[PDB]
Symmetry: D2
Subunit: 197 residues, 4 copies
């Protein structure tokens, strides 16, 4: 079944940009809950279907979307987060940089639009840098709740805008979080994602 991926660093390795207690709760509590809920959903869909109860199997689709989205979203999230002193922060280079410039004008303009995109989210949700699977063309998208980036879009970089991703440190000052997190984004990971398939 699905498992919680370990982090590549200690919970407090993203300070002062994200607090240890946030990293701790977020990974060990919130994501774990999505892992658990993802396994429970697949198991119920399975057991309902072996019984020919499609009404029941189809009634689990929202929980599969919520938890399956959560597990995926957070997995990609830790992956593109890293300590500022090491591979976190800065900006991309090579092929990824060139497409960002060609699709957004500059990295700085992309940053602004993404922060703007994050700001505009009403309630719980995510903003993503994504590409078209076929052309590679880049876009800034947002997702409500745990809805994922899938299908025609491949996700490259995600910032979680749920209140639980920042409130303990930044409280209602969500702008400060959105500005701060760029220091711990791992653009090496984003490039790998972009430069593949």
């Amino acid at each position: 079944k699905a498992t919680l991926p370990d982090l590549k660093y200690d919970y407090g390795a993203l300070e002062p940009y994200i607090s240890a207690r946030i990293m701790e709760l977020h990974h060990s509590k919130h994501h774990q809950t999505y892992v658990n809920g993802l396994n429970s959903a697949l198991e119920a869909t399975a057991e309902a279907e072996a019984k020919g109860d499609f009404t029941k199997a189809a009634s689990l689709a929202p929980l599969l979307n919520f938890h399956g989205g959560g597990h995926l979203n957070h997995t990609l999230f830790w992956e593109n987060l890293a300590p500022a002193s090491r591979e976190g922060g800065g900006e991309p280079d090579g092929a990824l940089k060139k497409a960002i410039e060609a699709d957004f004008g500059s990295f700085e303009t992309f940053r602004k639009q993404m922060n703007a995109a994050l700001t505009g989210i009403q309630g719980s949700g995510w903003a993503w840098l994504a590409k078209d699977k076929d052309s590679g063309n880049l876009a800034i998208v947002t997702r409500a709740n745990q809805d994922p980036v899938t299908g025609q879009l491949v996700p490259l970089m995600g910032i979680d805008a749920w209140e639980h991703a920042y409130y303990l440190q930044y409280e209602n000052r969500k702008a400060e979080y959105f500005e701060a997190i760029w220091n711990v984004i791992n653009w090496k990971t984003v490039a790998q994602r972009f430069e593949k398939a």
Copy 2:
């Protein structure tokens, strides 16, 4: 494996209220598409799960909801329709009639409010008479697209408000469709559901 149920009468039995062409298409084409989509979603989900691809599994949630919802909703829809010369039309009686009367004042008022609810649906959707699983109180709810009536509420009588349910015969004049369909509602089916919920 999920299957398209046959109707209990011929495609033209509900004329003049719903045309034979509408019924034919609605069943043979539209509902069939939902059945196939449901089995396809469920196969693709199991295929993924065996290969530990939870990303793919979760990505199929929308199609499971949509097609799983279409199958259930249309299944119940056909069941609460019957030719006017038989079990269709008229008004409910017995415990059902008293329950309608309790929660809506009269059958006529319920019929008025449901017609309004159908009229107020923006885009594609369904209106249902539903029953609270604990108290038994009745209400009119609306659902977008093919989202089902599930959880706290049990569906008893549905009317489809997607344009394919009426456009060939009534065009934009949805109010005429909503008024006409009461002539072919199977209140014997509804009362059966009412007894078991």
Copy 3:
């Protein structure tokens, strides 16, 4: 122009159930932001309407829904909260208590159903005890984000399930918050609302 209502008590007066900092931010930051956004939207709608720019006028709808809902919800929310030493806590009496018994069997069943409702919200949202304006029947509903309770239902008592409502004090342990808040619900306010709806 819309204005921030004043609380009827000091920020720390709902302790230990809700912390002072939470009440402070929730009222002076979050609600104040909705009030500002609502006025901003209504000014913008008027400015475009006078220029015959109906494209602009329509585009301001999500903001009008978002802020105007947030204004309504929180206004109501402060009104059905009070200190335990005073009007807060306990159980309702009179017509309300009995109406609750009629539609949920007991006050405690309703309580469990409310907490179950709150817990089941995916993402940001609210749970309400509402009353049907025609039948007088009570029900528990949920709303996404700041989507209000309007139309056929009249809100009677609301609980806020957005994370900023509890996270500083309860962190991810929302069930502690949902359980804890009943000690500061103002049933007399809810009773006034019941009487007049």
Copy 4:
């Protein structure tokens, strides 16, 4: 007062690709209903605000989005439609041709993508070729119901996937409609919107 815009041709001018009956219904009944609906929402929002009733004003937001969106979407829709014999059909030229070829690979690749997006719409909705207001970066997007394309994205070409846009002629065969409509898309208009 918002008003129903005039079409620049007779209702039967888009046949055999869109029928006279669909066109007449779509314009004279559906869009007219969005026009009246918008004006009513703006009125009641005007009434409400004067009364200091902000609960009533906010409660009108769903209708404003729905009707205001429908007015905008259909306005643009007729503008990017024209009789095949004239401004309709064919391919876009100019820098718009170049952009599509840059962003999608080919017009043929782009077309298929949109047709697939349109087919992929669950329920009522639209598909749009849009550009980013700041970069000119093209995207295919979809909107539920009458939700419009505003803000960071500028719509350039819309195709309506509501069932009332095709069912009378094509019935359930939505793909037939999606493939057909390309012979009456006005790319001159789409090219204007692109050049802003």
